[PDB]
Amino acid sequence: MVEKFVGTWKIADSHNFGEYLKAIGAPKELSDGGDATTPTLYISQKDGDKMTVKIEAGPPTFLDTQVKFKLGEEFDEFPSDRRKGVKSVVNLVGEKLVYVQKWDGKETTYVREIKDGKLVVTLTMGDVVAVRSYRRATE
Ligand SMILES: C=CC1=C(C)/C(=C/c2[nH]c(Cc3[nH]c(/C=C4\NC(=O)C(C)=C4C=C)c(C)c3CCC(=O)O)c(CCC(=O)O)c2C)NC1=O
């Protein structure tokens, strides 16, 4: 189930991602150009239940990172966008993956799936919604 996410991905499309980042209160300097950012993801999994994801943030800041979690187990995150007290939990909803972050009383959601070969993520903060899609690297 998670297996279909594993691999290396490069951005292909980005939609309203700068306004999304602006919507979660991310700094202007970090929100500006958000759809021009080219992250590379390195996704792996273990026992069908734990996942690891290394991100190479790429130009210009190279805020490279990694997250490790278990499906269901809430964990603490320290996001590029500079928020605090962030608790995140990831769970399978059917064949989609659902990622929820909570901080400062607030809630944002990330829904990721596979769509004609592309890893597609819909980001939701309120009714501010962004979409980005990744194609296999480099194939
Ligand atoms: C299969 C599951 C899956 C997971 C778990 C996954 C996680 C994931 N995807 C991204 C890209 C990444 N980066 C950012 C934010 C930024 N990007 C920039 O260049 C800058 C400056 C910012 C900060 C303002 C977000 C919101 C995301 C998540 C959206 C995405 O996956 O593309 C991150 C880094 C977010 C951060 O550094 O705080 C993580 C942990 N991607 C997947 O496909």
C-alpha to C-alpha distance for 64 and 75, rounded to whole angstroms: 19
| Ligand 1 atom showing the smallest separation from residue 2 Cα | 1
132 lines ligand 1 (CB under 6 A): yes
Please give the full DSSP string across 66-98, using - where no structure is assigned. Answer: EEEEETTB-EEE--TT---SEEEEEEEETTEEE
55, β-bridge pairs: 41, 65
Number of domains in the chain: 1
CATH code assigned at 134: 2.40.128.20
Pairing of strands 128-136, 50-56: unpaired
89 within 8 A of 74, measured Cβ to Cβ: yes
How far CA 3 is from CA of 8, 15, 22, 26, 68, in Å, comes to 12, 26, 32, 31, 15
Resolution in angstroms comes to 2.3
Token pair in block for residue 17: 């991602």
Rounded Cα gap, residues 112 and 114, in angstroms: 7
For 117, the 3-state DSSP assignment is coil
Nearest CA to ligand 1 atom 10: 55
Residue of 19, 87, 110, 120 with the most ligand 1 atoms within 8 Å of its CB, for mutation: 110
- Residue 76, number of CB atoms within 10 A of its CB: 9
Pocket perturbation via mutation, ligand 1, pick of 22, 64, 67, 95 by most ligand atoms within 8 A of CB = 67
Could you tell me if the CB of 114 is within 6 A of ligand 1?
A: no
Are β-strands 75-77 and 65-70 bridged in parallel, bridged antiparallel, or unpaired?
unpaired
Q: Residue 29 belongs to what domain range?
A: 1-139
d(CA 37, CA 103): 24
Cα 71 from Cα 8, distance rounded (Å) = 20
| Beta pairing partners, 67 | 53
